[PDB]
Amino acid sequence: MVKVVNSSGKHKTATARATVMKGTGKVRINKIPLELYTPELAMMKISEPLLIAGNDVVSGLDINVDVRGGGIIGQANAVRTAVARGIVEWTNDTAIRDNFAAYDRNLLVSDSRQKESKNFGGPGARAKYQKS
Amino acid sequence: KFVNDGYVKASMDEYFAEQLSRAGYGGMELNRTPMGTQIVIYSEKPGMVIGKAGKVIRKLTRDVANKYSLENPQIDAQEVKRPELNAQMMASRLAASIERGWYFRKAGHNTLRAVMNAGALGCEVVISGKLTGARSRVEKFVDGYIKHSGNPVEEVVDEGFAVAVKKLGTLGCKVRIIQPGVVLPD
Amino acid sequence: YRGKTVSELQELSLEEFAELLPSRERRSLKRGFTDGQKKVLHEFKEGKKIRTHHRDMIILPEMIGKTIEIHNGKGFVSVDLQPEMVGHRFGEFAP
Amino acid sequence: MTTVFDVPATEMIEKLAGILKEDDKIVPPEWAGNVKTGVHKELPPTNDDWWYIRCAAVLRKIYTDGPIGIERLRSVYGGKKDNGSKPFHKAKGSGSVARKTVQQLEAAGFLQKVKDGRTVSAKGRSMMDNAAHELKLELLEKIPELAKY
Amino acid sequence: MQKARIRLSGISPKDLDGVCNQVKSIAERTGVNISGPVPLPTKKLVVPTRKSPSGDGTATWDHWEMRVHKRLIDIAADERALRQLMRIQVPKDINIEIVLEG
Amino acid sequence: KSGRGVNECKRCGRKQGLVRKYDIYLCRHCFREIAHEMGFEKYS
RNA sequence: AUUGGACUCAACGCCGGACAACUCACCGGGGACGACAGCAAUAGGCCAGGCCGAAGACCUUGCCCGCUGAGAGGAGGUGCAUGGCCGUCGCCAGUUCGUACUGUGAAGCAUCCUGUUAAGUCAGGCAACGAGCGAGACCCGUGCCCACUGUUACCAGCAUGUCCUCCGGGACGAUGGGUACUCUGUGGGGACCGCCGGUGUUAAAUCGGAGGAAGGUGCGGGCCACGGUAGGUCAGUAUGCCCCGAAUUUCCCGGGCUACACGCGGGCUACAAUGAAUGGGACAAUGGGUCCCUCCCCUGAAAAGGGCUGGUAAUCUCACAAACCCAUCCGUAGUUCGGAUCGAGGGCUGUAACUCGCCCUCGUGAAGCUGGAAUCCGUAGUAAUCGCGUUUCAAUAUAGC
Ligand SMILES: [Zn+2]
């Protein structure tokens, strides 16, 4: 009926409560219409697996999103992974899973983690001060 | 809360070492009943702890209450469970043996031999301080298992440290003690 | 010559002259005074020879004219008082 | 629904600014021409309709962000404060500007007094939904598959 | 509905979980409506210090990270049940907190 | 307890470089020595 | 007086040392300060005033230790007497002991050659055999799965409180409710070069294949030996001796460490359409706060003032993140791109703001225009960058973390 998963690999912080269902076709992506989707500059990065699914699929589908936080680009790819998982959770084919894994995974965990715990001796995690 | 409890458990019987070290101080364990804050002393020779008609026991009351907010200031006087396993009074005994006329060459050797005969995985008494001449030296004794990096130096192994106020200078001891427990059967 | 002509400045009120002075002096005088500057004010209103010893004090309206002496690390120094320096700090003249 | 979120924020906020300009109860009070937008920026605003647009933006912020206190509004309305050779703190907005705008909003009845700020009143929500229907009327022909199909 | 809340936040969580299981078994013996053991966030109190005592010496800082393990549990209220909960042998490593909300 | 360096740390009579953080009131050397005895540990 | 320690690595944002009183350790000026002993002759207190910065400090007055020694003590000395601590050789793999054995002997062999490894890590062959400390193992960091898991976290349907009417609901998770799926923090599994295709030898060891969260130190960290470097540590701590024992003890006042012809080290800002106004969206965690951050209300332009609310803290607040991006507005040049000094002014912090503070507002908008020799940091969410808490707590962080 309704799919609720926020696991996306968690790019830094994600907070993407998935909500995908089936209705008349009216799709409201996180209290925002898809025609006038408010982020706009980041929706190009977010509309990749939905574009791969097809207009007929997501027109058939119906999706909502509940969110808490996360950085803007971490949101822009973690929410895309969450939408891909919600796409595959609904009764579908494995061809969409093949296409989703084909371009750049977007079902996996972000292998590059949050940060690296910078040590005393320099400004950054690996960088250090200037030695004359 | 926990910080004040750790501070009291590290300080209350450790400032008692300024006067209780003559009686055979060996540290203490905190037994904090909600009714009262019990404090224990492990006296090697608690006859001096008994006091000259209470002269020794009744010196541990004013400080406990005037600035720490404690109820029923009391310290029962007991002894440590094992003599050689406690390293603190072993270091005190080695420093006293140096100061008293015992063989300072052989005092550390006898102390190490006694500690390793008492059922230890390993021990090492190392004496940094000018024993004979005007220059510092070292008198390390190596025997038994003493691991230096990892969990055992954190909690499994312990330390016995004392002082020695000689006319040339002040030194001490660093008797490492490890309780006889298997680490890894690898 | 602060707020008015120089003649009536000595007879001005404490808070009116403070409002003539900036915010720093006004708040310095606003939150009371310690014992030393009260003693200095009392002796100035008596008229004896005065060694102030305070390098931060504020010159008063009727306190002008008479000479003030200030401790300068080395012992003391005598300095004149003028209409230009009223409301200033005592340590501004003997570094 | 004719919610505000079915339209871009720019057109809706400009519509609300125009409707507040039509209303005489919102005015630039006296010191609009000698005080900046707060404390962060360098100079006062150059746009002609800065006060009405600021009130409309504060209305939209109260609607989309719930009841907001005046200091929350000041924190939202900060900026990259120039210090010269100092590490560029972001301080606050302005208390009097935000408070006068909010008082104009409540006198207009759109903002509703609450303990943790002033949540937007229900009448303002209904009128802004109707204005959203107006602006959505400008793009009703985008998706015909929305009425009951 | 009435609940008696339990708040604990300490240094050793093993005896904390043991006391939680002891209270759970007391509730199952007494049939008290219970909320399960809820892992709260652990206070990771940290304060570092430079290792080097003297003047010369490069970057040497021993960081003192400490975890304060929090746990919030809710159970019902009852006089014999509360006396049973108050007579439990809880270790010194945790602090026991109660809120009798009725 | 309000001053620049008037308050001293425990044990070490000292008026500078004292850890008043966490209500500890210890010098950095003294607190470094006794943190392992007072329950503190360098877990990381 | 502009106090000392420290001088390549490994001194020069270090001594948590961002010194307004303390910090204080340099000094101006006082004043108190010798346990015991010898010896001169128990002193102070107490009206007021003289002077005294002032201090019944001591005096005219009201009026119930002089000193040495030995002491504490001494931020004086010697880090070249030390204890213990740390930099560093240095993550460096080294250091080694027993037995026998070669050697007149110091010493040798093990501790060697071949590969291998992050490593004396390991295998193979040896006059070598075994063993310890370091190493690794070990403890941590976080990511895939589950056992229970909800508050103050959570809405994810169940249902309500107001509008859209095109109709599911949009907003509400406060709640009833549901912990359906999740974040969850206590116990557990995972990924061992394990299998397969190359190499090395058929060993120790080595590449893509795995639909798999990490294939072959998953990824980053603490602990880091035998010793020296007479390295720093008498200035965190205790301490030997020389010394100071009425000053190097000891308590405030003022100055000073900020003073500056000046050499040098590290940091903060800067010259584009990659930039000044106006909006838009929710965004991050670490970690604070109850004697302190601040809820909302009122007042001003600001800093901020009053009142009043939340917090012993998954409640609550500092708390907006900026950088950002866009209808856009915005303009062509070394100037709205670019801001050091100084003059009036209002602030809170403190017992005190001239030396010596920071906040705020205005007017002067300058120097300057990607910087040679030389160097410097750095291999993945790392450099870089943009801002963020915290520590030096009264402010002030261009700083460390
Ligand atoms: Zn100390």
TrEMBL record, chain D:
Q: Which domain of life is it from?
A: Archaea
The protein's GO terms of the molecular function aspect are: RNA binding; structural constituent of ribosome
Q: Which Pfam families match?
A: Ribosomal_S19e
Q: Indicate the quaternary assembly.
A: Part of the 30S ribosomal subunit.
Output the HAMAP family linked to this UniProt entry. Answer: Ribosomal_eS19
Annotated NCBIfam families: PRK09333.1
Return the similarity comment.
Belongs to the eukaryotic ribosomal protein eS19 family.
Q: What does this protein do?
A: May be involved in maturation of the 30S ribosomal subunit.
Could you tell me which PANTHER family the record lists for this protein?
40S RIBOSOMAL PROTEIN S19
Q: Mind telling me what this protein is named?
A: Small ribosomal subunit protein eS19
Q: What is the organism field in this record?
A: Methanosarcina acetivorans
Q: What is the lineage of its organism?
A: Archaea, Methanobacteriati, Methanobacteriota, Stenosarchaea group, Methanomicrobia
